Amino acid sequence: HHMLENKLGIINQLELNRVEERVSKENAKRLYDSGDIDRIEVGTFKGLSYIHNYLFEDIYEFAGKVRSQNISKGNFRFAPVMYLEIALEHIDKMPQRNLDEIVAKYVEMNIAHPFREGNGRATRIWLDLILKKELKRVVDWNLINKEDYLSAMERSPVKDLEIKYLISNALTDKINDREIFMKGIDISYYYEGYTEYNVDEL
Amino acid sequence: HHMLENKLGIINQLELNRVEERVSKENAKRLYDSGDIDRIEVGTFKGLSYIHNYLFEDIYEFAGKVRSQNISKGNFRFAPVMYLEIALEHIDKMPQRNLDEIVAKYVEMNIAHPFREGNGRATRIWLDLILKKELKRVVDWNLINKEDYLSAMERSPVKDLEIKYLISNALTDKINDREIFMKGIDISYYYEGYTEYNVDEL
Amino acid sequence: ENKLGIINQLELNRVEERVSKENAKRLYDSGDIDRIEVGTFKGLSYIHNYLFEDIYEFAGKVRSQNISKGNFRFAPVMYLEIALEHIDKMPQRNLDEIVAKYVEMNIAHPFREGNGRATRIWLDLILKKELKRVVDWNLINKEDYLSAMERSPVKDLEIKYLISNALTDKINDREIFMKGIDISYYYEGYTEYNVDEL
Amino acid sequence: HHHMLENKLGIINQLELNRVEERVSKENAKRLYDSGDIDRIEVGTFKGLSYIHNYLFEDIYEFAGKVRSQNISKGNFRFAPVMYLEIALEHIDKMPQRNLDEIVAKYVEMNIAHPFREGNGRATRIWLDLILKKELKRVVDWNLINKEDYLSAMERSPVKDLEIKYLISNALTDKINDREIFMKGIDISYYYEGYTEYNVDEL
Amino acid sequence: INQLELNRVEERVSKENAKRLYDSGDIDRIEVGTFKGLSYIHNYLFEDIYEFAGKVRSQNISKGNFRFAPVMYLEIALEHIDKMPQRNLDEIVAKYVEMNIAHPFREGNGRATRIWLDLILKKELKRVVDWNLINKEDYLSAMERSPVKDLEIKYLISNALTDKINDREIFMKGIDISYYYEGYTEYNVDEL
Amino acid sequence: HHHMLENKLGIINQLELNRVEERVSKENAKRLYDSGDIDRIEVGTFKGLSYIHNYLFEDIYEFAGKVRSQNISKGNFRFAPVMYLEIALEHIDKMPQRNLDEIVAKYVEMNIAHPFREGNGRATRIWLDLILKKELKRVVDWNLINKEDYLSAMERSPVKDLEIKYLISNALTDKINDREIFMKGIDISYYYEGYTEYNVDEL
Lengths: 202, 202, 198, 203, 192, 203
Ligand SMILES: Nc1ncnc2c1ncn2[C@@H]1O[C@H](COP(=O)(O)OP(=O)(O)O)[C@@H](O)[C@H]1O
Ligand SMILES: Nc1ncnc2c1ncn2[C@@H]1O[C@H](COP(=O)(O)OP(=O)(O)O)[C@@H](O)[C@H]1O
Ligand SMILES: Nc1ncnc2c1ncn2[C@@H]1O[C@H](COP(=O)(O)OP(=O)(O)O)[C@@H](O)[C@H]1O
Ligand SMILES: Nc1ncnc2c1ncn2[C@@H]1O[C@H](COP(=O)(O)OP(=O)(O)O)[C@@H](O)[C@H]1O
Ligand SMILES: Nc1ncnc2c1ncn2[C@@H]1O[C@H](COP(=O)(O)OP(=O)(O)O)[C@@H](O)[C@H]1O
Ligand SMILES: Nc1ncnc2c1ncn2[C@@H]1O[C@H](COP(=O)(O)OP(=O)(O)O)[C@@H](O)[C@H]1O
Fold this sequence. Notes:
The structure is a homohexamer.
Chain A: H1 3-8, H2 13-33, H3 45-56, E1 72-73, E2 76-77, H4 84-92, H5 99-112, H6 119-135, E3 138-139, H7 146-155, H8 161-170, E4 171-172, H9 178-191
Antiparallel strand pairs in A: 1-2, 3-4
Helix pairs in contact in A: 2-3, 2-9, 3-6, 4-5, 5-6, 7-8
The complex binds adenosine-5'-diphosphate (ADP) (6 copies).
One adenosine-5'-diphosphate binds at residues 74-75, 77, 111, 118-122, 151, 154-155, 192-193 of chain F.
PDB class: toxin
Keywords: Toxin
Assembly: hexameric
């Protein structure tokens, strides 16, 4: 699964964590600066798969591809592989006209959790693209506290009020401001326990 | 709670996470290199409080003192504040003769969760000292996968088999090896989302 | 979110009660209630639309969003259709099977709202056809009922006991029906009107 | 015996009992405010909460104003055990209430304590408003908090109080002596609990 | 050593103790509805088998997803239970449900506390439980549910109550069914 | 209907029914091994598992070897919905089984599927052992897995299978054609499920 392990000779979890952060943040920076981010299908699993492969190819085996194993976090079982493809088609047809509908679509894509790893970071980029297109807003992720965010996502399959509230109060109209995107990548990786680098210095 | 946030006027989450890592890891290196770690009471809340205050004095308000608020993680509500002092009295009297008793005592101290923050890093140092005294072993924490460790702790209030096997298989006889300690500190902080520095380079 | 354009929650509660109870009275007194298919989603959909089409755009139609209550996630939309086909084929010969079928219909929770009130009407029509009984709903305490439904996806013992001990043979008694409407609405927090007096 | 109006004239079913309990205690809530009695209650203590509960439910609930002697639950949640209830209320009495974070934590602990057999919801929200009024010069406009949002947030709150804090924070108003805020808040608060027949204004 | 063999020995030895408890008349002489009475029952059944039989555990225990009363409150919880009323079925079942949450022994709480429950019902309602009339999986599910709502277990108990409160065969067959609930099926207690 | 012997023989006592169902199905398990029939079963497929289930239970359970038609639960866990059993079982048939990680994940999914009304635990463990024998040249020495450890690990396994994987891994033996391991394993397996009356050897 961790393609860099055998290639760089890493036998330490923290060292592997840092290298995967560096390489994927390099790809994340290029995604934005190349303008490739603007030519991705918005709000579909085809767009999400592209983001995920863009971030993690040469890092995760099968980056951009659905997982073949069932996974969980805390006590929550994500969508079973057996109807994973069915779930993703449903999400593709969900509406995205207002914040209520966009947050619900994001919550369902987190529940699907289609990749083995990288779901959190890749789906937040995907979410920002839906908000930018439909609401002319993106998230200022530093205004969402890490533990508040993770608690809200844990709560969200049952009730999405917490994550909707957090997102709503962090929306900004500066949808073409490069620094907001870049600051948000560092915060987004921080949520997942990657704190070594700043995307802008790579 | 976060003293550096209010003192230095930090307003970026990631910056606060990094400086809180730097200063507490600087203290962690001193704790070991000064020999102060070898003079602590072993297996008591007094000894755990000393460790917690050593790491987090001037970082967390009331470091080394029991919290006055109720806290939770995921879906789990930790020991009520009303009953914390008597819960710690019970843990002090728990036996620690073998791996079973030691792990059960560790699991109860995690359930007590006596500090507002920092329970994970502080209690793992405390655990290593119990294992050292009673079994002449310490944990090689890099041998315990981060996600395996965190899921095992979430499980442990119901059944501690998972954490016990993870600890058992990671034990090493190198109880006075500085490299094992320092690498364990870095892995331990990595479990909790701090990856910026290496402790022995501070 | 509604045809009446009401955006005050307490006002919506009261007008929904009066309007849907008005429709419920007509369902019964018109005899329309006796011409519903018994024990199928078609018939539940007919009841739900009868009650709610004045108010809610979706009346009688399967939801397209996912919903939950308490800590329970109801049947996912992606297999709502197949879930309802399965329920349509479940047996209803005795009380054990009728309660099982009711419990699965609640798990499906097919409408955006109104599932509780519409499906209890639907249940009474199954009991009436197969056991010549209906529920005397005031004999079921509100909090016992709600907690029994919360338990029922795991085990249906609680709700089965409550229904069994409240069955009555007065299956054509208009006051048993009307008071059952009022108690059923009371379960869901609507208490202003008596359907009888509308 | 808990419902002391159980056997009165015309009280023949659960709905009729619900309605008379709504009318009598809302009549009490109106007098509580319009008499000025509400302004004399000790703020932020269990002594204050029991005065409110007794004011609303005296002669409706047996033992109104008194701590329950039975354990109770709601949904999947077990409230504080009776065996240490009085000590739990003493600890709540000492909790700070200087800012919104602290006030909401104190409210959440009082709801976990759930000290009465019934009527905890409605009595404790009035109590909450008086704390907010004294300490922040704000009260909750309960009409800006949806019923199902509110109930779910309370179910969430023993684990994390973020949901209910957001709902309270966005509904705060500085109209702390506005009669309609209070009166409509009483009607909304009762509607949260399944009582909808009357407007407190009109009793 | 074989797990099954230990299980069979424990059944045989403790079921013998249950028969003596009833046949000797000792069961009629114990305090009804208190932890002291329950402790006497547990020691009587398991004296030879469990270390610290009849004594409150010193470890925290769980079953399924349920964490039983933590040891530090165990004494105060048993004290509360001792004071709980037992005048009707609602109160008895609540008292029984609280004693199961307490779970005061390391093992054998189920079998000892059901004997204890029958004695409360005998004294206060002049009824005991015909345990064969409560299906095993119905019972265990109802007990899992009981800390949240006791309606399930109350209905099962109510429909199984019999007025044959001094009938030796009701008690002995109840003992067999009670052990069956917990996975001991080898012996019939009256054939010991 | 489900318990075929209950009405045919008028067995009214739950313990007596438990013991006769143990005796009949354990007689069948003994014959499954001693006849060589076990060695012709397809390995790792629902067809093979259905063969085992019917072989043990066809005189005891109305639809032995056949998928259930109702939904079922155990503890707080709701097993795979009936509407999905077919797709679940088709997916499980395609899962790899080359190493212990993959075999355990496959066993965990077959338990979640829980395809029969009753008898899933005992039948699926025989099925598991035949996969391990084929792919790893090991079987489980079940007496080395404590009953409550096993039941707790299975309760845990839909979330994380590490607990059950450790128990299994540490109980593997290379004595894959040892009759005592198989027979004692049958007695322990039945003991896990609350059947302790007979020794399968002596039937
Ligand atoms: N208990 C939970 N239930 C549901 N979703 C969760 C839970 N905990 C975290 N999440 C969501 O899962 C995401 C993590 O997915 P993962 O594939 O691990 O991403 P990454 O590789 O980016 O860390 C989090 O960012 C959060 O959105
Ligand atoms: N759901 C859970 N239930 C119980 N314990 C947990 C859970 N999740 C994590 N833990 C334990 O709590 C620790 C974190 O406690 P915390 O006070 O946040 O420490 P730190 O400041 O070092 O991160 C983890 O290392 C783990 O041991
Ligand atoms: N936690 C729960 N789990 C499953 N079912 C529930 C739960 N709580 C309530 N129910 C059932 O759901 C019904 C409410 O559904 P809803 O669509 O809100 O109907 P209504 O609009 O009539 O109130 C209740 O009447 C009860 O039958
Ligand atoms: N599942 C739950 N867990 C914790 N608290 C809850 C839950 N559901 C509701 N609550 C809180 O409990 C209150 C109900 O208490 P109760 O004594 O019934 O008051 P009332 O008589 O006013 O209805 C609700 O207003 C809400 O604050
Ligand atoms: N998940 C659960 N939650 C609470 N109580 C339970 C649960 N499962 C079983 N019980 C109760 O616990 C009893 C088992 O207790 P235990 O100490 O193992 O007794 P025994 O040694 O007699 O088997 C059961 O008879 C039942 O009453
Ligand atoms: N809470 C649970 N969640 C998931 N699986 C469980 C749970 N409890 C037990 N199991 C699994 O289910 C099996 C029992 O299924 P069952 O069909 O009753 O088999 P049997 O008839 O052999 O007793 C157990 O052996 C265990 O593998």
